[PDB]
Amino acid sequence: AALTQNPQFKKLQTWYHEHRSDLNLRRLFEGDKDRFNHFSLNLNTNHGRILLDYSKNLVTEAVMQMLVDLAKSRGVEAARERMFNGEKINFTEDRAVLHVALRNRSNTPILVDGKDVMPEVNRVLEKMKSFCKRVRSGEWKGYSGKSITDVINIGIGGSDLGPLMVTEALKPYSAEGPRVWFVSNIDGTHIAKTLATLNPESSLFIIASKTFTTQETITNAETAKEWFLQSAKDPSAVAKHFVALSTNTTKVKEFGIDPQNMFEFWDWVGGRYSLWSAIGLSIALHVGFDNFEQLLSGAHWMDQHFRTTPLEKNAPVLLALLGIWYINFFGCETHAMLPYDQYLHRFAAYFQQGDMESNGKYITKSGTRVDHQTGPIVWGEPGTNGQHAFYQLIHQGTKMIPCDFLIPVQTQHPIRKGLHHKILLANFLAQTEALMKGKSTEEARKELQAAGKSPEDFEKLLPHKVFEGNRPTNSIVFTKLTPFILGALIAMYEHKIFVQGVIWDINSFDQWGVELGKQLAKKIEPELDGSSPVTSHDSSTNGLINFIKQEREA
Amino acid sequence: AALTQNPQFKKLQTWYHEHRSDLNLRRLFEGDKDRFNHFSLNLNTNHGRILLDYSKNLVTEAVMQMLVDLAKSRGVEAARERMFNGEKINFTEDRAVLHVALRNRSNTPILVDGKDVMPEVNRVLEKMKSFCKRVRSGEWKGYSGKSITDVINIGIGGSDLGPLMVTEALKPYSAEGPRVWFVSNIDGTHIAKTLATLNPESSLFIIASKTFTTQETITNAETAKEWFLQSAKDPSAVAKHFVALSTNTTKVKEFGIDPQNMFEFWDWVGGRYSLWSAIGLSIALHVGFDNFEQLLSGAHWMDQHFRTTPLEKNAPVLLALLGIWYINFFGCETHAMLPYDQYLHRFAAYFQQGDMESNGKYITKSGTRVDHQTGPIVWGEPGTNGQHAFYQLIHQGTKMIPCDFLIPVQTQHPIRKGLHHKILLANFLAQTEALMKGKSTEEARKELQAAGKSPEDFEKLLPHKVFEGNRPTNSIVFTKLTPFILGALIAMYEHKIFVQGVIWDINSFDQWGVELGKQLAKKIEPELDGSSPVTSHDSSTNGLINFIKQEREA
Ligand SMILES: O=C(O)[C@@H](O)[C@H](O)[C@H](O)COP(=O)(O)O
């Protein structure tokens, strides 16, 4: 009811229904000669630049204006201050949403129920700084008096994607640091394949769980612990090999970790927003706390930009609006994120949890059901691999797929006088050019004529070689991929997802769909036990259980 | 015109428009008490079993019948014999489509323009067998007289996904084998990060390119070669460190590889179907040729099943039809593949190229444009990670997402008396149960009542905790994930994609969208050279190039 009842919203509907044909990229580029200048945003962090080029979008000035009007009218600005001021905008859980307090480099007091949270934030941070320095330097020794050579993080979901994504991306900054491993799936393979190369004497396990009760997280933790005690044999040896990142002390303690080894965070830190908290121990540990501090700073700059810049020229805002355009008006079910950077190979996946767990909702603030589309399906792989993979569909399939193209201008490995990056750049420029302009029948006919074939031959080939084009894209180009910028990049999308939720009137910070999967299987577990058949379910679920049992013996 | 002009097709349209409401999973399970038995397929390869359970689909008997009728009427059966008999069904390129000849364990003669191809297939295979045996045993020595410890594959796309996906999946079978590395992206990082750990003395590079002219493949090849010759210094040393998998001998030769070191394949082997050919050297090499031979056999069994089993009970066929149902009638843009197996973590990605590069077309056999949907968007990550990630949207978002659930019954690492796999099973059973049945307002209300809250409290929470359900899924359960079964699994989907193309009347075996990206960037490359600004493009493309140049100096 909310969105579709909106005057500016309804106004867009009619213009769209009315001009859709007027929306051709090719022609739009004839019309305005500095289209580029009008649909581009240059941000300078003073530690590098980020160019947000949104010109190849089926969009005009009036549309942009109308889209800004929509955001204004739906409370984006004040929704935003509520977030920063520590109010509880997580309305179903009745929580504050304060990932931004975690990178609040200025230590401005942010209060929750009166109490400033910053002193707690900085405290856990200093604990992180010293723990890092001790482990990285070799002072912190293992049970046989050895130095740590491997750090092993155990957790899943929020406690998983961040650290991995970032470590994979900040690889170059890790020479002086110990190796990280990430075990997340319950699948015994995951834990089995890691330990069988580790030496317990120089290994360190981090149990990352906000509630410290996640099934798969906790049983991996125990399997690890059993493997460890076979060699150590002394229970107190545990204190030098296991640390925890949770909110529940009691549980931390019932698991046997020393309370001096617990690095805490708060219920106001959402899982899919926690890399900035204690959850990031693994990053700082592998890449140095200094660079971690730099990650947090980058996100701090963008937080500042989001909060104080007017909507017409506000990166996160723009990005959210161009998306609502594609989702609620053109109808596109997905959105591809395509980083032209091998280090960022898990970036897309991260936002899958990022965007999708946040915005795949259907109930309103009013308790009403949505009667419009919400969060899209987000996918991708780094380029140029993608091009040799699924681009054929983006170019000539029967569905529209808006895409984000990302790339750094300076590569961390300028081998062969920068020839490699050169080719990676050219490819990053032309796919979007081509996705724009396409190729008409005539264009291809002439080309065939030139290849010297003859119209009777190429009569049947021709159509297959035609490209319609007019497919939209964003291009995101930044100076170099360092901790700072990467901080700013993630924080950017974070805010994008936020503005959209506000406009769709949903809660971007709970995840009952997720909370439920965490209970759902509790009844199936004991039933698998015997070799006797189950009947307590649907014929499918039962059919399946029974195939399993008969088979496990095969 | 083809599909939408079809009598059986048009007949489905009306039934659908007519019964859509009749389609509720929950109720459908009350109705038929052995729904399971009627919508399930048990295949026994004699080297294990695969259960295809398609009962949790919004489908009935009449629909299934009508769907089979559609396939029959559109030439699925004979399209199929054309493929096996070596006719050129790749109509735009005028090629035969014979990936099935590669695993033709029975050496039945399959002719292309009169000549049986099998003798060539088996030849390259024996070359593979001996090369493997020599490298694996240590007889094949490097330039300083050392044994090979690392194999490095270089290629992208078809020449990339297969080998990687399979090696990651057949991990356990690799103890006796050397490590494999896969370098594919042009991004200098990719090649830089691999070599800086390798020793040239014991390393072997495989240049996998069908045309042997792929830009990124060839410049990685040269960068590798330069790195190699710094140490070896003798050009003939190359012959013991570089092998090639191509169709173009000349080019192979102009690159400096010894013709005795070239393992060839044929233009009738499509890139996204080539893991079964010489392209698989890397698998056999890492996992033993015996297991490779077993992979090929598994695919051979399924080829046999596809070809001789009637449509109503033909796995690939069923799978294709349930998809056309969701795509052309319900309207779903994507399809998720969700393997509950960590080893299969690149499986989904593989089919992205698999399905999408094959079926993201829009021109017909008649040269007509489609006026209906084609290949979907395929995505996924292994479970249960996914559940802690994007399942929230699958459960409570505003779009329908059919899903394939896959799992082996026996795990390769039955640690802790098989507790791990046990929990992984229970989770694999309940997500689909839950995606089916959901949870009504009453159900959740009662639950809240029980948690002892009070209706005024939970009045506003309630709706957010409701699940509509009625979301469809396939469950694919196999005995164990071995080479054989994995062979059969891949081959299964391969045929699925095939049947769909036939029904949509498109060419599943060319990829001009891809062929073009391979030319598109040739003009941008030289322009990046100076520090002088470009003007020869759209204001966007130019704007971008110029930001780049000014920046690269920053
Ligand atoms: O986003 C979420 O809430 C989930 O992905 C959590 O990250 C995951 O379930 C782990 O929860 P915990 O941190 O309590 O172990």
Ligand SMILES: O=C(O)[C@@H](O)[C@H](O)[C@H](O)COP(=O)(O)O
């Ligand atoms: O599917 C395709 O055709 C592409 O993915 C190719 O795999 C890729 O371009 C590599 O081609 P080549 O084998 O000629 O180097």
